[PDB]
Design a protein around this motif. Structure first.
Motif, PDB file in Angstrom:
ATOM      1  N   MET C 271     -33.265 -17.947  72.869  1.00 17.40           N
ATOM      2  CA  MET C 271     -33.762 -18.559  71.764  1.00 17.40           C
ATOM      3  C   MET C 271     -33.143 -18.703  70.462  1.00 17.40           C
ATOM      4  O   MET C 271     -31.990 -18.107  70.261  1.00 17.40           O
ATOM      5  CB  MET C 271     -34.787 -16.956  71.298  1.00 17.40           C
ATOM      6  N   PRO C 272     -33.288 -19.707  69.879  1.00 15.74           N
ATOM      7  CA  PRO C 272     -32.431 -20.478  68.808  1.00 15.74           C
ATOM      8  C   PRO C 272     -32.271 -19.526  67.473  1.00 15.74           C
ATOM      9  O   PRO C 272     -33.199 -19.114  66.914  1.00 15.74           O
ATOM     10  CB  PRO C 272     -33.024 -21.738  68.444  1.00 15.74           C
ATOM     11  N   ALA C 274     -31.220 -19.481  63.359  1.00 16.66           N
ATOM     12  CA  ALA C 274     -31.599 -20.382  62.249  1.00 16.66           C
ATOM     13  C   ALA C 274     -30.901 -21.904  62.136  1.00 16.66           C
ATOM     14  O   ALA C 274     -29.706 -21.805  62.579  1.00 16.66           O
ATOM     15  CB  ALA C 274     -31.256 -19.706  60.768  1.00 16.66           C
ATOM     16  N   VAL C 275     -31.708 -22.850  61.885  1.00 17.74           N
ATOM     17  CA  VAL C 275     -31.102 -24.125  61.807  1.00 17.74           C
ATOM     18  C   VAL C 275     -31.014 -24.862  63.158  1.00 17.74           C
ATOM     19  O   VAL C 275     -30.477 -25.723  63.205  1.00 17.74           O
ATOM     20  CB  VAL C 275     -29.929 -24.582  60.751  1.00 17.74           C
ATOM     21  N   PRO C 309     -23.138 -31.764  57.845  1.00 14.49           N
ATOM     22  CA  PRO C 309     -24.176 -32.540  58.127  1.00 14.49           C
ATOM     23  C   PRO C 309     -25.153 -32.309  57.146  1.00 14.49           C
ATOM     24  O   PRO C 309     -25.282 -31.099  56.226  1.00 14.49           O
ATOM     25  CB  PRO C 309     -24.805 -32.053  59.417  1.00 14.49           C
ATOM     26  N   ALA C 310     -25.900 -33.545  56.784  1.00 15.39           N
ATOM     27  CA  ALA C 310     -26.839 -33.418  55.621  1.00 15.39           C
ATOM     28  C   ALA C 310     -26.180 -33.198  54.262  1.00 15.39           C
ATOM     29  O   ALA C 310     -27.062 -32.842  53.223  1.00 15.39           O
ATOM     30  CB  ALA C 310     -28.176 -32.787  55.698  1.00 15.39           C
ATOM     31  N   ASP C 311     -25.009 -33.651  53.990  1.00 15.39           N
ATOM     32  CA  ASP C 311     -24.320 -33.040  52.767  1.00 15.39           C
ATOM     33  C   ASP C 311     -24.564 -31.712  52.329  1.00 15.39           C
ATOM     34  O   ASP C 311     -24.360 -31.421  51.137  1.00 15.39           O
ATOM     35  CB  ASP C 311     -24.387 -34.144  51.779  1.00 15.39           C
ATOM     36  N   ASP C 312     -24.453 -30.688  53.285  1.00 14.92           N
ATOM     37  CA  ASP C 312     -24.986 -29.144  52.999  1.00 14.92           C
ATOM     38  C   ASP C 312     -23.745 -28.435  53.312  1.00 14.92           C
ATOM     39  O   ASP C 312     -23.475 -28.428  54.574  1.00 14.92           O
ATOM     40  CB  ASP C 312     -26.235 -29.068  53.548  1.00 14.92           C
ATOM     41  N   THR C 314     -23.840 -25.480  52.833  1.00 15.53           N
ATOM     42  CA  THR C 314     -24.444 -24.090  53.240  1.00 15.53           C
ATOM     43  C   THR C 314     -25.008 -24.238  54.686  1.00 15.53           C
ATOM     44  O   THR C 314     -25.591 -23.062  54.793  1.00 15.53           O
ATOM     45  CB  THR C 314     -25.539 -23.467  52.013  1.00 15.53           C
ATOM     46  N   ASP C 315     -25.146 -25.506  55.301  1.00 11.12           N
ATOM     47  CA  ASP C 315     -25.404 -25.424  56.637  1.00 11.12           C
ATOM     48  C   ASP C 315     -24.893 -24.520  57.529  1.00 11.12           C
ATOM     49  O   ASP C 315     -23.252 -24.103  57.223  1.00 11.12           O
ATOM     50  CB  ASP C 315     -25.310 -26.709  56.938  1.00 11.12           C
ATOM     51  N   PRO C 316     -25.319 -23.595  58.491  1.00 12.30           N
ATOM     52  CA  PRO C 316     -24.557 -22.628  59.180  1.00 12.30           C
ATOM     53  C   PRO C 316     -23.336 -23.294  59.921  1.00 12.30           C
ATOM     54  O   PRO C 316     -22.309 -22.537  59.955  1.00 12.30           O
ATOM     55  CB  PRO C 316     -25.740 -22.066  60.140  1.00 12.30           C
TER      56      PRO C 316
END
Lengths: 71, 56, 470, 470
Positions: C271-272, C274-275, C309-312, C314-316
């Motif tokens: 089960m995945p 977040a993100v 990725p996505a210039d973020d 705070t991406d995990p």
């Protein structure tokens, strides 16, 4: 206004089976007069709560969810 | 009158520069909130899809 | 016997069933050598890594190559260990895949060589280094503004024609020159022609004889790309454990490790989180990067590329890489167009080691004054573009006249660029560059032209260049 | 050879036959049951086969409501899919999913031939080699968004704009100029509006050329699946036998996909992205690839599309759009202005508006009309706020010719003759290209802002302006 109106209530303490069948009971009471020649106004207050009640009804019967877990 | 017109053009220049700075600060705070909503949207849709796959 | 057979094949996932009590442990390697008996079969040389125990004497594995042609009932041998990958002097100057097999066309490594397991626990609390010591590189922007740490993790933000490979290559040359160590390049899940270009660049610069290269490219399964940084890391661990030296370990695009783990998790049926990232994201990043440490006898320092990725930020996957980074070096294209080589952005590049308890008081004060003058110069470029060079101030004109010389003294002549420019290149010790930037900040070299400071190692080479110019 | 009902799971009914007597996929099953006592309900259902389960069991999809079904009821196998009557018998008659007449004009006898619903697409050997333009007689349609003969069109319009009137004069124009039967297929969209559209069929005289298939929102989603295929197999008779250029109107094909997503969750499929069935592209293509122009005839299809919440990124509008060749966008701001038809000229695009298809002159005139109307939809706030006196004497020429073009885009219709008394016009492509070319050149600047309103040709502009006194 109670000389001509019919109030159908399915409160939150009642089980979601009774919230699920409240608009269909209301429109059945309406179409009884509709198929006699009368003119009926049926107000469905918060059909979104019917959608939540039917979501509960389908998740407890173990039917697969969709988006926002609605069936 | 000429001195007041020069100060008029300079004051409009300073006002529009401050407008650009306020707009850019609003851009960066809205992109932070955009990235938060983007992460929340993708984790919501992946939880929905994997719950529907676990339903079977 | 330790030979079982395949029960299920579904994409890269293969389930293999052994006898009872004879199952392989988790993360072992399983070999499938099959010669085609008939015209209705395919010759198969395939390697599986154990991932789970499903029960009923079965084992769920992930594949290192394509599973096309596998037959249910084809026998699988148990190696008794995880992926054994050769280590030592036989790996230097050689290109390997994830299995520790030489991609190169000279020859294969004989079977008597020492081979280390991939999956090893991190070095213990008894064995770590008590102090924080500085990995001296000889690059003035690195040694002055963003100091590296022996045992530290460093992020490269750049790529696409700014000078990442040249900086990589000069780091290998300088560390193998002065500190006596080696480097290991682990290309985790990137473009194959860029791996070819990087191979030929390290080949014709002479850098390749002191490095060991490991490539697991995009065409390989996610179970292969998940284990590339670990199979380069187990080569670097030999040189810091059995030889006891300070080793570089480059991971091109550490983000590919995270998303390859995510793809292996989605294939395994978890089960995945977040993100869409695996639940095991933080512990897979930890089990990679807690083996990159400074121990008592040696160290592995690691320069890593991060995609964000996505210039973020705070991406995990950036948020779990950044909790292990000890420094950040940022390559900027506006400095590569200006002529500054290396193109390290002096104000955006930060480090945890830039603190007076680690580098000393003089290093810290010189670095902070350089950062303040360059920040004031960036705050003055819009005034120069609006009002002009005249009528700004006298002190601000001194700040511009100081900060241009500082900004062009940041660049060096690399030993890698000797084959393109003819200039022999230089190794600048950290005391020499602190004393040089201190002498610039005091105003000792204001009378010199600013083009004398361009592409110059020490602070005597700039005055010799100014005497040769005029 | 007649089996029992095992499960009744909403609209999905599971039927088990004898061993070796299973029906093929998509065959129509029948349940004809008389009430044995007072505890039972008379039931007449049609089920189509969807899946084959393990032990002689078949999951089916119901065309009507499954309320009243008992486990163990006898199911009749027809040995064929849903057979639907086609021919000249269907002209002027309203049909349900099962090819039964909804209206009370009579019943179709059993001697007429019945084509099956499910049919493979026409082959690559059989299609037309190059694009022909379906000529409509509508000046916005012929000029700016040309309909190809055999393609798919997207109506983006709501109510109160004139979608039904545009539909009816498309039927009238293709009936009087191409000899083309039209077929209207209402797929899950507002029974009241289908009733209004049928009574306007009756009023306009358009009904005598049209076959109509209605399955609305009230019916279960298997019916809302098979409606569009019923209308399409009615159109395919006229194409493949009469050799005609047939119209085929599918109202809101989004309902054809969401009916599939309603069924597929109960059939036992894993949910795909955004909650849509996993087989959405193939179920869309098996509808959209039977709408082709072969060497014999043609089926062109104008298809209304409801985009939910104006989100053009969810997969079902994306896969409806990937089959489209042109769009005609019906705008309320042009209907309130008096422009009939209220086709938005700038937003309605076409794949055929290219000089290899329409020619050089038509492409240049259409592109210049789009340029002057786009230059006019940049001065709207300036005209509305700052006025006409302040603009320029070069942009007021632009708004002058823009109003003369924007009112000449409207026609008098043949189906609007009963409402206004004006007979209506069929305008060929050459004459409307000549008319817009003569307005762009400036030959008709002296004629007023009206007399372009609701006329067919440019000689009618001259006659109406002479009737106005000018």
């Amino acid at each position: 206004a109670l000389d001509y109106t019919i109030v159908v209530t399915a409160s939150a303490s009642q089980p979601a089976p009774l919230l699920f069948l409240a608009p269909y009971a209301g429109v059945a009471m309406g179409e009884y007069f509709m198929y006699k020649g009368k003119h009926v106004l049926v107000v469905y207050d918060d059909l979104s709560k019917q959608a939540a009640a039917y979501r509960e009804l389908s998740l407890l019967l173990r039917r697969p969810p969709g988006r926002e877990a609605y069936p | 009158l000429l001195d007041a017109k020069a100060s008029e053009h300079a004051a409009r220049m300073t006002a529009m520069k401050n407008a650009t700075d306020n707009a850019n600060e609003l851009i960066r705070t809205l992109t932070l909130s955009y990235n938060r909503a983007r992460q929340a949207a993708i984790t919501q849709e992946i939880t929905e899809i994997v719950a529907g796959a676990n339903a079977l | 016997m330790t030979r079982g057979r395949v029960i299920q094949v579904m994409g890269p996932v293969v389930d293999v069933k052994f006898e009872n009590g004879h199952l392989p442990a988790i993360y072992n390697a399983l070999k499938i050598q099959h010669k085609a008996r008939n015209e209705n079969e395919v010759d198969i040389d395939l390697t599986l890594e154990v991932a789970l125990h499903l029960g009923d004497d079965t084992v769920r594995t992930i594949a290192m190559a394509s599973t096309d042609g596998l037959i249910r009932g084809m026998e699988v041998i148990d190696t008794g260990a995880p992926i054994s990958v050769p280590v030592g002097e036989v790996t230097l100057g050689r290109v390997f895949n994830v299995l520790g097999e030489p991609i190169d066309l000279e020859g294969d490594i004989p079977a008597d060589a020492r081979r280390d397991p991939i999956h090893r626990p991190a070095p213990k609390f008894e064995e770590l280094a008590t102090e924080v010591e500085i990995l001296e590189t000889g690059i003035k922007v690195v040694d002055l503004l963003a100091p590296y740490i022996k045992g530290g993790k460093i992020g490269l933000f750049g790529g696409a024609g700014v000078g990442k490979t040249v900086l990589i290559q000069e780091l290998i040359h300088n560390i193998a020159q002065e500190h006596g160590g080696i480097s290991v390049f682990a290309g985790v899940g990137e473009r194959t022609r860029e791996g070819n270009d990087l191979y030929h660049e390290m080949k014709d610069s002479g850098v390749i004889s002191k490095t060991a290269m490991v490539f697991g490219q995009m065409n390989e399964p996610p179970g292969a790309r998940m284990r590339v940084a670990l199979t380069g890391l187990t080569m670097a661990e030999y040189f810091r454990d059995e030889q006891g030296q300070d080793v570089l370990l480059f991971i091109d695009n550490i983000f590919r490790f995270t998303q390859a783990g995510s793809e292996v998790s989605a294939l395994l049926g978890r089960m995945p989180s977040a993100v869409g990232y695996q639940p095991t994201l933080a512990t897979e990043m930890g089990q990679l990067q807690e083996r990159i440490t400074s121990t008592a006898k040696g160290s592995i320092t690691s320069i890593q590329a991060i995609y964000v990725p996505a210039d973020d930020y705070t991406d995990p996957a950036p948020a779990t890489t950044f909790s292990h980074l000890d420094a950040t070096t940022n390559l900027e294209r506006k400095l590569a167009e200006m002529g500054i080589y290396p193109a390290v952005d002096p104000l955006a590049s930060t480090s945890r080691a830039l603190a007076p308890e680690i580098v000393g008081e003089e290093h810290y004060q010189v670095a902070r004054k350089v950062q303040q003058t360059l920040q004031r110069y960036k705050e003055l470029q819009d005034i120069i573009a609006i009002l002009g060079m005249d009528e700004l101030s006298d002190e601000d004109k001194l700040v511009v006249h100081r900060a241009r010389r500082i900004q062009f003294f940041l660049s060096q002549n690399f030993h890698v660029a000797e084959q393109f420019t003819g200039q022999p290149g230089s190794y600048v010790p950290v005391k020499e560059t602190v004393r040089g930037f201190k002498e610039i900040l005091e105003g000792k070299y204001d009378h010199l032209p600013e083009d004398a400071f361009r592409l110059v190692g020490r602070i005597e080479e700039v005055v010799e260049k100014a005497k040769a110019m005029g």
